[PDB]
Design an enzyme around this catalytic site. Structure first.
Site, PDB file in Angstrom:
ATOM      1  N   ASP A 177      -6.156  -0.801   7.989  1.00 47.32           N
ATOM      2  CA  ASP A 177      -5.620  -1.119   6.674  1.00 47.32           C
ATOM      3  C   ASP A 177      -6.543  -2.091   5.947  1.00 47.32           C
ATOM      4  O   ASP A 177      -7.427  -2.706   6.543  1.00 47.32           O
ATOM      5  CB  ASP A 177      -4.214  -1.709   6.798  1.00 47.32           C
ATOM      6  CG  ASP A 177      -3.492  -1.787   5.468  1.00 47.32           C
ATOM      7  OD1 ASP A 177      -4.094  -1.409   4.442  1.00 47.32           O
ATOM      8  OD2 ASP A 177      -2.323  -2.227   5.445  1.00 47.32           O
ATOM      9  N   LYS A 201      -9.276  -5.554   7.186  1.00 47.85           N
ATOM     10  CA  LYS A 201      -8.652  -6.710   7.820  1.00 47.85           C
ATOM     11  C   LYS A 201      -9.425  -7.170   9.050  1.00 47.85           C
ATOM     12  O   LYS A 201      -9.619  -8.375   9.250  1.00 47.85           O
ATOM     13  CB  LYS A 201      -7.211  -6.378   8.193  1.00 47.85           C
ATOM     14  CG  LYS A 201      -6.279  -6.306   7.008  1.00 47.85           C
ATOM     15  CD  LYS A 201      -4.843  -6.141   7.444  1.00 47.85           C
ATOM     16  CE  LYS A 201      -3.900  -6.212   6.267  1.00 47.85           C
ATOM     17  NZ  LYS A 201      -2.492  -5.988   6.674  1.00 47.85           N
ATOM     18  N   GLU A 218      -4.411  -6.656   0.792  1.00 46.36           N
ATOM     19  CA  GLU A 218      -3.757  -6.573  -0.506  1.00 46.36           C
ATOM     20  C   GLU A 218      -3.288  -7.959  -0.926  1.00 46.36           C
ATOM     21  O   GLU A 218      -3.260  -8.899  -0.129  1.00 46.36           O
ATOM     22  CB  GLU A 218      -2.569  -5.607  -0.469  1.00 46.36           C
ATOM     23  CG  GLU A 218      -2.935  -4.187  -0.100  1.00 46.36           C
ATOM     24  CD  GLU A 218      -1.746  -3.253  -0.152  1.00 46.36           C
ATOM     25  OE1 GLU A 218      -0.618  -3.741  -0.379  1.00 46.36           O
ATOM     26  OE2 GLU A 218      -1.937  -2.034   0.031  1.00 46.36           O
ATOM     27  N   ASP A 248       3.763  -2.745  13.288  1.00 45.59           N
ATOM     28  CA  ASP A 248       5.001  -2.777  12.521  1.00 45.59           C
ATOM     29  C   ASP A 248       5.740  -1.444  12.548  1.00 45.59           C
ATOM     30  O   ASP A 248       6.681  -1.267  11.766  1.00 45.59           O
ATOM     31  CB  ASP A 248       4.725  -3.175  11.068  1.00 45.59           C
ATOM     32  CG  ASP A 248       3.835  -2.182  10.349  1.00 45.59           C
ATOM     33  OD1 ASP A 248       3.275  -1.292  11.021  1.00 45.59           O
ATOM     34  OD2 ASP A 248       3.699  -2.287   9.111  1.00 45.59           O
ATOM     35  N   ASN A 249       5.348  -0.507  13.408  1.00 45.24           N
ATOM     36  CA  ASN A 249       6.008   0.785  13.516  1.00 45.24           C
ATOM     37  C   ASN A 249       6.225   1.124  14.982  1.00 45.24           C
ATOM     38  O   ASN A 249       5.506   0.641  15.858  1.00 45.24           O
ATOM     39  CB  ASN A 249       5.193   1.893  12.836  1.00 45.24           C
ATOM     40  CG  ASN A 249       3.802   2.032  13.410  1.00 45.24           C
ATOM     41  OD1 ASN A 249       3.497   3.002  14.098  1.00 45.24           O
ATOM     42  ND2 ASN A 249       2.942   1.066  13.120  1.00 45.24           N
ATOM     43  N   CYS A 262      24.595  16.588   1.516  1.00 46.19           N
ATOM     44  CA  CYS A 262      25.669  16.858   0.567  1.00 46.19           C
ATOM     45  C   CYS A 262      26.041  15.610  -0.221  1.00 46.19           C
ATOM     46  O   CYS A 262      26.467  15.713  -1.375  1.00 46.19           O
ATOM     47  CB  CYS A 262      26.894  17.416   1.292  1.00 46.19           C
ATOM     48  SG  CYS A 262      27.179  16.763   2.955  1.00 46.19           S
ATOM     49  N   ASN A 299      -0.289  -9.567   0.908  1.00 44.06           N
ATOM     50  CA  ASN A 299      -0.503  -9.965   2.293  1.00 44.06           C
ATOM     51  C   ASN A 299      -0.950 -11.414   2.418  1.00 44.06           C
ATOM     52  O   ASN A 299      -0.775 -12.009   3.484  1.00 44.06           O
ATOM     53  CB  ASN A 299      -1.545  -9.061   2.948  1.00 44.06           C
ATOM     54  CG  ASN A 299      -1.186  -7.601   2.855  1.00 44.06           C
ATOM     55  OD1 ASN A 299      -2.019  -6.770   2.506  1.00 44.06           O
ATOM     56  ND2 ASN A 299       0.062  -7.276   3.164  1.00 44.06           N
ATOM     57  N   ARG A 349       7.309 -10.274  -0.196  1.00 43.37           N
ATOM     58  CA  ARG A 349       8.058 -10.179   1.051  1.00 43.37           C
ATOM     59  C   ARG A 349       8.938 -11.396   1.294  1.00 43.37           C
ATOM     60  O   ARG A 349      10.016 -11.267   1.881  1.00 43.37           O
ATOM     61  CB  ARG A 349       7.098 -10.001   2.224  1.00 43.37           C
ATOM     62  CG  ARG A 349       6.094  -8.885   2.038  1.00 43.37           C
ATOM     63  CD  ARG A 349       6.771  -7.547   1.862  1.00 43.37           C
ATOM     64  NE  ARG A 349       5.800  -6.468   1.746  1.00 43.37           N
ATOM     65  CZ  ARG A 349       5.225  -6.091   0.613  1.00 43.37           C
ATOM     66  NH1 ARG A 349       5.502  -6.687  -0.535  1.00 43.37           N
ATOM     67  NH2 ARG A 349       4.351  -5.091   0.630  1.00 43.37           N
TER      68      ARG A 349
END
Ligand SMILES: Nc1ncnc2c1ncn2[C@@H]1O[C@H](COP(=O)(O)OP(=O)(O)OP(=O)(O)O)[C@@H](O)[C@H]1O
Ligand SMILES: [Mg+2]
Ligand SMILES: [Mg+2]
Lengths: 147, 75, 985
Positions: free
Chosen positions: C452, C474, C455, C524-525, C580, C458, C9
C-alpha cells in the site's frame, strides 16, 4: 472445509437423494452443480432445474451461495436466480447437510411465499389472478425447464 | 377460565382456556381462530415470552389475564 | 473546523464535540524520557491545543534505551530542548514548546498535567496545588518490568459517556398499559436496569413521543418495563425507542489523601494481592532515591536490595498497612529499578495518553485511581541474570541490559524476524525492534512487506511518515525512518512491495521462510491473517497476531507444538442484509446506503466494463449469449451507453441525471405501490405495510430542494467523467437546463416463443462494429471514499437520503454515509501503542524459548472502560492415531514423490488406514467412490504428474513441496482424522 465438503459428497454418494442430484464441477470441491426435480403437486411438474453452489472458505460456517441457472417463474426467485431462503440467511448454523437445503428449495418450489416476495409483480399476479399465475408457471417450466 | 390476547393492531381476542392447558394448545387455538402458524406466534405475558413445552400455571397465569401476540416474520 | 481529512479514523472513535473540546486544552508533560516522549507523541497525534515540555536534565547515553528522538550526538544537551524540534513535526496543528523553570502559579495555564520521573515530594507539592484548582493530574512511572499510573481529575469530575458504546435503539412491537415494552420478533434490546429511554413515532400513545426519559426495568431478553402509563393511554403499537445516556459525577482524592487509603484497579485477577505490595514498593523506591541523591538501586545488587527491603518494612509499619510483605517480589522490584524497556514505556504511554484524552474531553470512564502493572513473566530463565551480566556497558542498550543482561542482548541481536504489513502496528513494531536492537548482530536481519501507499489520513497514527511522504511506499519509508532512529540497522532491513498471498510464494518460498525466527502480523483483514497462519504452521515458526478496533485491542501468540493456531478460533462474521430487504423494503439507513452503493456500481461501473469488453474481445457477444445470466441486459447496456444515450455535451448529462432521478425515485415506487397498494392485506388478514415494512411515497422533483440538486449534480458529474466531458458546478446552468424538461408519460403496467432471440439478434446487429471504433474507450468509475473531489460519497449520500425520504427514514449526513459505505475501521494511536507494547513484551518470551504454556499470555484490553485482561493460550488438541499421540495442528506426514498407488499402499500397511479421499488445494485428486476406469487411469501416476494433469497447470520451478489433505477410514469403518501430508518433490 474440504473434509466436511467430502463427508457430504460421500453421504450423497451413498444415501440417494432421489429427487435431487449434486456433484462437484469438474474436479473442484468448492463448486457444485445440483439438479432439482419439480414437485408433482406443483405447476413446475416434470421440470429439471439446475443450481450452482459455491461453498465458502469458512464453510461449514458461512452459508453456501446457491443460485438458480434455469429460468423459473416464482415469486421468491428473481431473474438472476437469487433465492429468498431463510436457511441460507440466519438459520444456517452449521448442523445441516446439502440435502436439507435442496429439500427446503423443493418445498419453496412446491408453494411460494408471496407475503414477503422478491419479485413484486409475480407475487401480485399470484395473489390476485391465481389461474394466470398457474398458466404462466406451466408455460415457463415447459419452455425452459424441459429439454 | 377466560383470557384476552391483544394483537399488534389493537384487536382483542377472547379465549376459553384452563390453567393446566399447554402453550401448544393455546397456539393451536390461535392458529384455528386467526390462521397464524404456531411457529410464528410469539405470546408474551408480564414481560415474559411464553415457551413451548410448558403450561399456563408455570407462568402464574390466572383469571382474565392479558397476553400479547406478535408475529415472527420470516425472510 | 476539524480537518476530517486527517482525523478521519479518530473522529469515528471520539466524535466532533469531543475533539472540538479537546482542541482547546493545554497539556503539560514533566519528564522527557521514553515514557514522557511516548505520552507527548500520542498527545500531539491526538490533536490537543498545545504541549509544553519541562526536563532540564542533560542527556545521557543510557537514556537512549527507550528515547527514539535522541541521538548519540545529543549527549550533554537537555532532553526537552533536543526533543521539542522532532516532536513539532508530528502534527502541524499542535505547537510544542519548552519551559526552563516551573513555578506553581504557572500550572494554572494548563488543562492537564502529566508527571514522570519525579520524586514523591515534588509530586505531593504539585498535586496539593493542582487538586484544589481543578486541574487534571496524572502521574506515571516505569521501573523495569513494573509500571504505575495515578489519576486525579478533581472532586467533581463529570463523565458524560462511561462505556463508549453507541446508544441502544430498537423498533417496538407493542407497549402495554403497564409500561411493558416489547421488541420485534427475535430482537434483543440489550438494555440494563436503571437506564433511560425515549420513544418516537409511537401510534396510540402520543404522550411517550414528547421525549422525556423514563426508567427501564428489564424483565427479559426481548421485553422490559417503563412503569405506569395508565393516564397516557391503554396500549400503543409500533414506534422506535432510543437509549438516553446521562452524565455521571466521579469524585477523586488527592495524592496525599490516597497514599494512606488507595483505591486500586486490578489489571489481572490471577494476582490480586500484588498491588498492595507495589504500593509500598514504589514509595520505598522514592524514599531510597531521596536518601541517595536520586540514585536508584543498582541492578541485581544484594546490599541495595536489603536496604530497599528495610525501607519497605519501615513504610509498611508507618502507614499501618496490615499486609505481609513478599520479600521475593519486593527485591525483584529493587533489582530492576534502573531498567528502561521500550515495550513497557509504549504500553504505559498509550494508557497515560488515553487518560489525558479522557481528562480533556470528559469522556469514557477513567482509572480510579491507582493502576499497578507488571509483566514479570517476561524475565528470561534460560540465561544467566546476575550482577556481573547486568552491569552497564556504556552503550545505548544499558536500560535493557539492566533487566535482561548481556547474554539475552546477544540473543536478541541475532534475530531474523518477518513483519507483515507496515500500518500503525507495523510502525510501532519497527520502532520497538529498533530500540531493542533486534537484528543488529552479524547474523541478524529484518524483512518488512507492504503493497500500500501512504495517504493523508494515515498520518494521524503512523508517526514514521510525514506529509512530504504522501504517495510513497510504506515499507521503504518505514525502513528508512527506523534506520535513522538506530544507525546500526543500516543494511540489516529489507523492504518488499509484495502482497502476501498465494501469488507471492515465489519470493516468500521455502528458502526465505526456513531462515526466519518469528513472524509478526500487522494486517487488517482475515484472509491474509489466515494465509500467514497456514504458512507458519507448515514451516513451524512462532507467530504474533495483534488487532485493534477503536479503543479495543487484543494480542495472541502462536508457538509451534505448544498452542493452537490463529485459524482454530472463530469470530462473529459480518452482517449482510437479505436481498428482499434491500431491493424493495428497507427500514434502516444502512439498507438505503447499501442500495445506493449497488446503484452506483450498476450505473457507472458495470455497463462501462461491458462496453469496454465488447470493444476489445472479438468474440464477446457469442460468449455472453450463452454464459451470462442476462444477455439481454448486457446488450441493452451496450446499446444505451454507445449509441442511444451517448452524451455530446454536459447538458445531455444533466438531462440523463434528471431522467435517472425519475426512474429510481418516482417510477419504481409507483410500480411497487401498484403491485402492493397501501390498503392491501396479507394472506392472514394483517395489513401488508406493517412492522418492518414501511409504505413508500413517490418523490416529485423540486429543483429548490437541496437533496434533489445534490443528486442531480453528482449524477451528471459522474456521467461526464465516464464520457470524459467537462463538468460544471454553477447552479445557473442546472436551473436553466432542467427548466425545459418534459417528463415522458408513465403508467404502471399490469403485465397480462422463440421470437425473443430474433429481437436480440436484431439489437445485436444494430450495434456499431468493433472495427469502426478503434482507440475509443469509456472510463469506469472505481469507488474511492478518501477523495472528496470525485463525487462518489456525494452521490451515495444523495441517493441514500432520497431513498430514505421515499420510505420516511431519518436521513444521515455525509459523515455517517462515509463511515458505513466505506467500511471504515475506527482507529486510534493509543490503542496501537498499547498493542505494540504487549506484542513486544511477548516477543522476549518467544526469544527466550519458554516451553510451558502457563508462561505465555494472550492479552485483551478496552481503554474506554480501563479494562485489561490476560489469559493463557489454548493448548493444541491431541488425538490418537494407530495407538500413538498426534498433535492435530503441528504434525504432518513426510513422504517422497511416490505414485498414488504407492501412497495408498503405504497408508494401508504402515498406519493401518484405508485412504478414502485425497485432495490438494481445491481439487479432488482421488476419491474412493470414483469409477474404476478413472482410478485405473490415475493410479500409476506420480503425485506431481497427477496434480499437473488434474489442475491443468504445470508446477512452478520454485515449487518444492505439496500439501495434501487426506480423509481415511480405520479397519472397522470408523472415520479417523489424520494430519496433512507433505510430499517432497
Ligand atoms: N495481504 C496483505 N499483505 C501485505 N500487507 C497487507 C496485506 N493486507 C493489508 N496489508 C497492509 O496492512 C496495513 C494495514 O494497516 P491499516 O489498516 O492501519 O492501514 P490502511 O488499511 O491503509 O488504512 P485505513 O484502514 O485507515 O483506511 C497496510 O499497510 C496494508 O498495506
Ligand atoms: Mg491504505
Ligand atoms: Mg485498513
Amino acid at each position: 472445509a474440504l473434509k466436511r465438503i467430502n463427508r457430504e459428497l460421500a453421504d450423497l454418494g451413498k444415501d440417494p437423494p432421489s429427487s435431487s442430484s449434486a456433484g462437484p464441477v469438474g474436479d473442484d470441491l468448492f463448486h457444485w452443480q445440483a439438479t432439482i426435480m419439480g414437485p408433482a403437486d406443483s405447476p413446475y411438474a416434470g421440470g429439471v432445474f439446475f443450481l450452482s453452489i459455491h461453498f465458502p472458505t469458512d464453510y461449514p460456517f458461512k452459508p453456501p451461495k446457491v443460485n438458480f441457472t434455469t429460468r423459473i417463474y416464482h415469486p421468491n426467485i428473481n431473474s438472476n436466480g437469487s433465492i429468498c431462503l431463510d436457511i441460507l440467511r440466519d438459520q444456517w448454523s452449521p448442523a445441516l447437510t446439502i440435502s436439507k437445503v435442496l429439500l427446503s428449495i423443493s418445498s419453496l418450489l412446491t408453494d411460494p411465499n408471496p407475503d414477503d416476495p422478491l419479485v413484486p409483480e409475480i407475487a401480485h399476479v399470484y395473489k390476485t389472478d391465481r389461474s394466470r399465475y398457474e398458466l404462466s408457471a406451466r408455460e415457463w417450466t415447459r419452455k425452459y425447464a424441459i429439454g | 377460565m377466560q383470557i384476552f390476547v391483544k394483537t399488534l393492531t389493537g384487536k382483542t381476542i377472547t379465549l376459553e382456556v384452563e390453567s393446566s392447558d399447554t402453550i401448544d394448545n393455546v397456539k393451536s387455538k390461535i392458529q384455528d381462530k386467526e390462521g397464524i402458524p404456531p411457529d410464528q406466534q410469539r405470546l408474551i405475558f408480564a414481560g415474559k415470552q411464553l415457551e413451548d413445552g410448558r403450561t399456563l400455571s408455570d407462568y402464574n397465569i390466572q383469571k382474565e389475564s392479558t397476553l400479547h401476540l406478535v408475529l415472527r416474520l420470516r425472510g | 473546523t476539524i480537518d476530517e481529512g486527517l482525523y478521519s479514523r479518530q473522529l469515528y472513535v471520539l466524535g466532533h464535540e469531543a475533539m472540538k473540546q479537546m482542541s482547546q486544552s493545554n497539556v503539560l508533560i514533566i519528564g522527557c524520557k521514553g515514557l514522557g516522549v511516548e505520552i507527548a507523541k500520542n498527545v500531539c497525534l491526538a490533536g490537543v491545543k498545545s504541549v509544553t515540555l519541562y526536563d532540564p536534565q542533560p542527556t545521557r547515553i543510557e537514556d537512549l534505551s527507550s528515547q527514539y528522538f535522541l541521538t548519540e550526538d545529543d549527549i550533554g544537551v537537555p532532553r526537552a530542548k533536543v526533543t521539542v524540534s522532532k516532536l513539532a513535526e508530528l502534527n502541524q496543528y499542535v505547537p510544542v514548546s519548552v519551559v526552563d523553570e516551573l513555578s506553581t502559579e504557572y500550572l494554572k495555564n494548563f488543562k492537564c498535567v502529566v508527571v514522570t520521573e519525579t520524586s514523591l515530594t515534588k509530586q505531593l507539592e504539585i498535586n496539593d496545588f493542582t487538586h484544589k484548582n481543578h486541574i487534571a493530574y496524572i502521574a506515571a512511572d516505569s521501573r523495569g518490568l513494573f509500571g504505575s499510573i495515578f489519576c486525579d481529575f478533581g472532586e467533581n469530575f463529570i463523565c458524560t459517556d462511561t462505556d463508549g458504546n453507541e446508544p441502544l435503539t430498537g423498533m417496538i412491537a407493542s407497549i402495554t398499559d403497564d409500561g411493558v415494552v416489547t421488541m420485534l420478533e427475535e430482537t434483543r434490546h440489550g438494555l440494563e436496569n436503571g437506564d433511560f429511554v425515549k420513544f418516537t413515532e409511537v401510534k396510540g400513545m402520543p404522550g411517550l413521543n414528547d421525549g422525556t426519559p423514563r426508567k427501564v426495568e428489564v424483565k427479559g431478553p426481548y421485553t422490559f418495563s417503563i412503569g405506569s402509563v395508565k393516564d397516557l393511554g391503554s396500549a400503543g403499537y409500533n414506534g422506535v425507542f432510543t437509549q438516553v445516556k446521562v452524565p455521571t459525577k466521579i469524585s477523586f482524592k488527592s495524592l496525599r489523601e490516597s497514599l494512606k487509603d488507595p483505591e486500586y484497579v486490578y489489571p489481572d485477577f490471577g494476582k490480586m494481592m500484588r498491588p498492595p505490595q507495589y504500593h509500598i514498593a514504589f514509595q520505598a523506591l522514592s524514599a531510597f532515591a531521596d536518601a541517595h541523591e536520586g540514585s536508584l538501586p543498582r541492578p541485581r545488587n544484594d546490599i541495595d536490595a536489603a536496604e530497599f527491603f528495610e525501607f519497605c518494612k519501615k513504610i509498611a509499619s508507618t502507614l499501618q498497612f496490615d499486609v505481609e510483605l513478599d520479600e521475593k517480589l519486593i527485591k525483584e522490584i529493587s533489582y530492576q529499578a534502573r531498567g528502561d524497556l521500550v515495550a513497557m514505556s509504549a504500553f504505559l504511554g498509550g494508557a497515560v495518553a488515553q487518560e489525558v484524552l479522557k481528562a480533556t474531553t470528559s469522556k469514557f470512564y477513567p482509572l480510579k485511581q491507582y493502576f499497578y502493572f507488571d509483566s514479570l513473566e517476561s524475565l528470561p530463565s534460560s540465561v544467566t541474570i546476575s550482577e556481573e551480566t547486568c552491569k552497564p556497558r556504556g552503550c545505548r542498550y544499558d536500560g535493557q541490559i539492566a533487566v535482561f543482561g548481556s547474554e539475552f542482548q546477544e540473543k536478541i541481536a541475532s534475530l531474523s524476524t518477518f513483519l507483515v504489513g507496515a500500518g500503525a502496528i507495523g510502525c510501532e513494531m519497527l520502532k520497538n525492534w529498533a530500540m531493542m536492537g533486534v537484528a543488529t548482530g552479524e547474523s541478524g536481519h529484518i524483512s518488512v512487506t507492504d503493497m500500500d501507499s501512504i495517504e493523508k489520513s494515515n498520518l494521524n497514527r503512523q508517526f514514521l511518515f510525514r506529509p512530504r511522504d504522501v504517495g510513497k511506499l510504506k515499507s521503504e519509508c518505514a525502513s528508512t525512518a527506523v534506520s535513522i532512529m538506530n544507525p546500526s540497522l543500516t543494511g540489516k532491513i529489507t523492504s518488499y512491495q509484495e502482497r502476501v498471498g498465494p501469488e507471492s510464494e515465489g519470493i516468500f518460498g521455502d528458502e526465505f521462510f526456513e531462515k526466519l525466527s518469528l513472524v509478526t502480523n500487522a494486517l487488517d483483514n482475515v484472509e491474509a491473517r489466515m494465509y500467514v497462519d497456514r504458512r507458519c504452521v507448515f514451516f513451524e515458526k512462532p507467530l504474533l497476531e495483534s488487532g485493534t478496533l477503536g479503543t479495543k485491542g487484543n494480542t495472541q501468540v502462536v508457538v509451534p507444538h505448544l498452542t493452537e493456531s490463529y485459524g482454530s478460533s472463530q469470530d462473529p462474521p459480518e452482517k449482510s442484509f437479505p436481498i428482499c430487504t434491500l431491493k424493495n423494503f428497507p427500514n434502516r439507513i444502512e439498507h438505503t446506503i447499501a442500495w445506493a452503493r449497488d446503484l452506483f456500481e450498476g450505473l457507472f461501473k458495470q455497463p462501462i466494463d461491458n462496453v469496454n469488453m465488447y470493444l476489445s474481445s472479438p468474440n464477446f457477444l457469442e460468449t455472453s449469449l450463452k454464459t451470462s445470466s442476462n444477455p439481454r441486459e448486457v446488450l441493452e447496456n451496450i446499446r444505451d451507453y454507445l449509441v442511444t444515450e451517448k452524451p455530446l455535451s454536459f447538458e445531455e448529462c444533466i438531462m440523463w441525471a434528471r431522467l435517472q432521478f425519475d426512474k429510481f425515485f418516482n417510477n419504481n415506487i409507483q410500480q411497487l405501490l401498484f403491485n402492493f397498494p397501501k390498503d392491501s392485506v396479507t394472506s392472514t388478514g394483517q395489513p401488508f405495510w406493517s412492522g418492518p415494512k414501511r409504505a413508500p411515497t413517490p418523490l416529485s422533483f423540486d429543483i429548490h430542494n437541496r437533496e434533489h440538486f445534490d443528486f442531480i449534480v453528482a449524477a451528471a458529474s459522474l456521467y461526464a467523467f465516464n464520457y470524459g466531458l467537462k463538468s460544471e458546478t454553477d447552479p445557473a446552468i442546472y436551473e436553466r437546463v432542467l427548466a425545459g424538461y418534459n417528463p415522458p408519460p408513465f403508467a404502471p403496467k399490469s403485465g397480462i416463443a422463440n421470437k425473443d432471440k430474433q429481437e436480440l439478434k436484431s439489437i445485436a446487429d444494430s450495434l456499431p462494429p468493433p472495427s469502426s471504433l478503434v482507440g475509443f474507450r469509456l472510463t469506469p468509475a472505481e469507488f474511492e471514499k478518501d477523495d472528496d473531489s470525485n463525487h462518489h460519497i456525494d452521490f451515495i449520500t444523495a441517493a441514500s437520503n432520497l431513498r430514505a425520504m421515499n420510505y420516511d427514514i431519518t436521513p444521515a449526513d455525509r459523515f455517517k454515509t462515509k463511515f458505513v459505505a466505506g467500511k471504515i475501521v475506527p482507529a486510534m494511536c493509543t490503542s496501537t501503542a498499547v498493542v505494540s507494547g504487549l506484542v513486544c513484551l511477548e516477543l522476549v518470551k518467544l526469544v527466550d524459548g519458554k516451553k510451558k504454556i502457563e508462561e505465555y499470555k494472550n492479552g485483551f484490553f478496552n481503554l474506554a472502560i480501563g479494562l485489561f485482561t490476560f489469559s493463557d493460550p489454548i493448548a493444541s488438541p491431541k488425538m490418537k492415531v494407530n495407538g500413538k499421540e498426534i498433535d492435530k495442528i503441528w504434525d504432518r506426514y513426510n513422504l517422497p514423490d511416490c505414485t498414488l498407488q504407492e501412497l495408498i499402499d503405504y497408508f494401508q500397511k504402515e498406519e493401518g488406514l484405508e485412504v478414502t479421499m485425497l485432495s490438494s488445494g481445491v481439487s479432488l485428486l482421488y476419491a474412493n467412490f470414483q469409477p474404476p476406469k478413472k482410478l485405473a487411469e490415475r493410479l500409476p501416476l506420480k503425485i506431481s504428474e497427477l496434480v499437473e494433469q488434474i489442475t491443468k497447470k504445470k508446477l512452478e520451478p520454485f515449487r518444492k513441496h505439496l500439501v495434501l489433505e487426506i480423509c481415511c477410514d480405520d479397519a472397522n469403518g470408523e472415520d479417523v482424522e489424520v494430519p496433512f501430508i507433505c510430499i517432497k518433490l
